[PDB]
Design an enzyme around this catalytic site. Structure first.
Site, short mmCIF file in Angstrom:
data_model
loop_
_atom_site.label_atom_id
_atom_site.label_comp_id
_atom_site.label_asym_id
_atom_site.label_seq_id
_atom_site.Cartn_x
_atom_site.Cartn_y
_atom_site.Cartn_z
N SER A 70 3.51 35.60 12.29
CA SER A 70 4.39 36.45 11.51
C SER A 70 5.19 35.62 10.51
CB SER A 70 5.32 37.24 12.47
OG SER A 70 6.32 37.91 11.81
N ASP A 86 -6.21 46.19 27.23
CA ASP A 86 -5.36 45.00 27.21
C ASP A 86 -5.94 43.99 26.24
OD1 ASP A 86 -3.70 42.93 27.70
OD2 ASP A 86 -4.45 42.53 29.74
#
Ligand SMILES: O=C1CN(Cc2ccccc2F)CC=N1
EC number: 3.4.23.22
Length: 330
Positions: A199, A35
């Protein structure tokens, strides 16, 4: 040193991936959910409330000659999906794919929430976010990566998740055979303890690319891709009959649909998520309503590049003094 382990989807939808991990002496092999959005290595154990164990493999510290109680230490964590776990702490030898760390904090669960009990395939979590998020009190503990880092050939790990197929976690090296083209690296903020990056924008199907900054986290422990409501609405508007369902808890679409791809930007590079990766199947057995793999982050407080996005790429988690992320097509 290096390590290399195969990661395997837990079910036919790629809801999560499990990776075998050796704990203790002799080894006890548990299948953990790696994770990158949390920082605790915790396991089902001989200490877990018996009614909360349903088919998981448990760690028994009393059977490990290298286990030591970390006196006074406790832990308690709550995850983005409302699940939780808590317990006490041992140090022990932990190996992943041939890479060994001695003295790793192994957080033994006394209590786990119902979603953990009900998932027989996940024996615990191995956190790979920054150690600043580790929940052990009163002495915070380091992740497996942070403890391994100095020994590694290069201070990196990589995630290569499969679509409906196994993939690989590598530690300490970048497998140049595992991706196509070049790796584009992008800046990371560690201020929230995550692999947080920006992004450069998105496209829906064959549509034009929209240049827009989207701050979010690279999180292998989250199944879906959670993005701003504007972006998500633009995606699902291209699917006839798709709608946001308050009763189901997100966007659903007709199971008869063919989904468009979704592209996200990494600097000047582009990662394409095929449409099939966005299908999470019937909302209930036999339903013709299917659950979408791209959902709004509006109710979360952060955008999450979860497995739907990451499985489309070869991803480098660069733990150099100034961390960075790398993405390549594959
Ligand atoms: O993103 C997540 C991660 N995890 C997904 C999941 C769903 C069904 C079955 C098992 C499983 F691990 C728990 C909740 N959200």
């Amino acid at each position: 040193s290096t390590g290399s382990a195969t990661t395997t989807p837990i079910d036919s939808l790629d809801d999560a991936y499990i990776t075998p991990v050796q704990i203790g002496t002799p080894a006890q092999t548990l299948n953990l959910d790696f994770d990158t959005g949390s920082s605790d290595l915790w396991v089902f154990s001989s200490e877990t409330t018996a009614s909360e164990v349903d088919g998981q493999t448990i760690y028994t510290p009393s059977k490990s000659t290298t286990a030591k109680l970390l006196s006074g230490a406790t832990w308690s964590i709550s995850y983005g999906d409302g699940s939780s776990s808590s317990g006490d702490v041992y140090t022990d030898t932990v190996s992943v794919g041939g890479l060994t760390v001695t003295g790793q904090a192994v957080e033994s669960a006394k209590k786990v929430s119902s979603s953990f009990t009900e998932d027989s395939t996940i024996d615990g979590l191995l956190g790979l976010a920054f150690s600043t998020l580790n929940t052990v009190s009163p002495t915070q503990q380091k992740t497996f990566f942070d403890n391994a880092k100095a020994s590694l050939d290069s201070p990196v790990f990589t995630a290569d998740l499969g679509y409906h197929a196994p993939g690989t976690y590598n530690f300490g090296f970048i497998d140049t055979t595992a991706y196509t083209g070049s790796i584009t690296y992008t800046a990371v903020s560690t201020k929230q303890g995550f692999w947080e990056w920006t992004s450069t924008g998105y496209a829906v199907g064959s549509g034009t690319f929209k240049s827009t900054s989207i701050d979010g986290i690279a999180d292998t422990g989250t199944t879906l891709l959670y993005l701003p409501a504007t972006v998500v609405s633009a995606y699902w508007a291209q699917v006839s009959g798709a709608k946001s369902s308050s009763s189901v808890g997100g966007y659903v679409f007709p199971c008869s649909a063919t989904l468009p791809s979704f592209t996200f930007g990494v600097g000047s590079a582009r990662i394409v998520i095929p449409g099939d990766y966005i299908d999470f199947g019937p909302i209930s057995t036999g339903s013709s309503s299917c659950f979408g793999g791209i959902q709004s982050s509006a109710g979360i407080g952060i955008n999450i590049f979860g497995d739907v996005a990451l499985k489309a790429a070869f991803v480098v988690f660069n733990g150099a003094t100034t961390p960075t992320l790398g993405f390549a097509s594959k």
